[PDB]
Design a protein around this motif. Structure first.
Motif, short mmCIF file in Angstrom:
data_model
loop_
_atom_site.label_atom_id
_atom_site.label_comp_id
_atom_site.label_asym_id
_atom_site.label_seq_id
_atom_site.Cartn_x
_atom_site.Cartn_y
_atom_site.Cartn_z
N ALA B 20 18.24 2.07 9.73
CA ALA B 20 19.63 2.41 9.63
C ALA B 20 20.57 1.74 8.86
O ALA B 20 20.46 0.51 9.16
CB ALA B 20 19.99 2.93 11.09
N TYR B 21 21.62 2.31 8.18
CA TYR B 21 22.58 1.61 7.44
C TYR B 21 24.00 1.65 7.80
O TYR B 21 24.97 1.21 7.22
CB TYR B 21 22.31 1.98 5.91
CG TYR B 21 21.01 1.70 5.29
CD1 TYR B 21 20.46 0.48 5.16
CD2 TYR B 21 20.15 3.02 5.30
CE1 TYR B 21 19.07 0.42 4.68
CE2 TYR B 21 19.03 2.90 4.67
CZ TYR B 21 18.51 1.66 4.51
OH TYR B 21 17.27 1.53 3.72
N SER B 22 24.21 2.41 8.92
CA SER B 22 25.38 2.85 9.44
C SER B 22 25.62 3.28 10.75
O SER B 22 24.41 3.65 11.38
CB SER B 22 26.22 3.87 8.83
OG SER B 22 27.53 4.19 8.92
N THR B 23 26.58 3.21 11.54
CA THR B 23 26.55 3.76 12.91
C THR B 23 26.68 5.13 12.96
O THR B 23 26.21 5.71 14.14
CB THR B 23 27.98 3.33 13.35
OG1 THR B 23 27.98 1.88 13.49
CG2 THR B 23 28.05 3.50 14.91
N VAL B 24 26.89 5.98 11.96
CA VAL B 24 26.86 7.20 12.01
C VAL B 24 25.83 7.77 10.62
O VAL B 24 26.09 7.08 9.67
CB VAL B 24 28.40 7.96 11.73
CG1 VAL B 24 28.00 9.68 11.25
CG2 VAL B 24 29.26 7.92 12.77
N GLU B 25 24.89 8.68 11.03
CA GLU B 25 23.66 8.89 10.23
C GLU B 25 23.82 10.51 10.08
O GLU B 25 24.09 11.09 11.01
CB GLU B 25 22.39 8.49 10.71
CG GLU B 25 22.12 7.01 10.82
CD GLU B 25 22.01 6.34 9.66
OE1 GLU B 25 22.87 6.38 8.71
OE2 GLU B 25 21.06 5.55 9.69
N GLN B 26 23.63 10.95 8.75
CA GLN B 26 23.85 12.32 8.70
C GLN B 26 22.68 12.85 7.98
O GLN B 26 21.88 12.31 7.17
CB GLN B 26 25.07 12.48 7.59
CG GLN B 26 26.35 12.25 8.21
CD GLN B 26 27.54 12.66 7.25
OE1 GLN B 26 27.65 13.61 6.47
NE2 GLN B 26 28.46 11.81 7.19
N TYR B 27 22.15 14.07 8.01
CA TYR B 27 21.28 14.79 7.47
C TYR B 27 21.46 16.43 7.22
O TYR B 27 22.32 16.79 8.02
CB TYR B 27 19.79 14.79 8.21
CG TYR B 27 19.82 15.26 9.52
CD1 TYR B 27 20.39 14.46 10.57
CD2 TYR B 27 19.53 16.29 9.63
CE1 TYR B 27 20.32 15.08 11.80
CE2 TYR B 27 19.46 17.00 11.28
CZ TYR B 27 19.76 16.26 12.19
OH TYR B 27 19.98 16.75 13.36
#
Lengths: 52, 52
Positions: B20-27
């Motif tokens: 993971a690269y951020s606190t919020v992940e999108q798809y």
């Protein structure tokens, strides 16, 4: 007096149909109306008309 | 020792891991290919529009 001779002009495609048109612009002018004449009411005896 | 050991952990060692690269992940997802319309149109008739 011709503005353009006969020409073929393709149209747009709004469905599975192919469309085109033929156009011609012009007008006849007779400068001297007194140098022509016409015979009217000439007898016809052969039956029928001209073919379509 | 009267408690569990490491060998009693099953799910945590089998689920795949991704960084993971951020606190919020999108798809993104593709829910469907279109709506429930008709498909038969007719000769020379423009078909209906459809969206996903």
């Amino acid at each position: 007096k011709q503005l353009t001779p006969m020409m073929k002009m393709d149209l747009a495609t709004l469905g599975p149909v192919i469309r085109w048109m033929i156009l011609m612009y012009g007008v006849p002018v007779m400068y001297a109306p007194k140098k022509f004449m016409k015979y009217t009411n000439i007898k016809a005896d052969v039956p029928g008309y001209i073919g379509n | 020792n009267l408690s569990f050991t490491d060998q009693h952990i099953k799910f945590w060692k089998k689920i795949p891991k991704q960084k993971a690269y951020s606190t919020v992940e999108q798809y993104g997802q593709l829910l469907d290919y279109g709506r429930s319309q008709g498909a038969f149109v007719g000769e020379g008739v423009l078909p209906d529009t459809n969206d996903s």
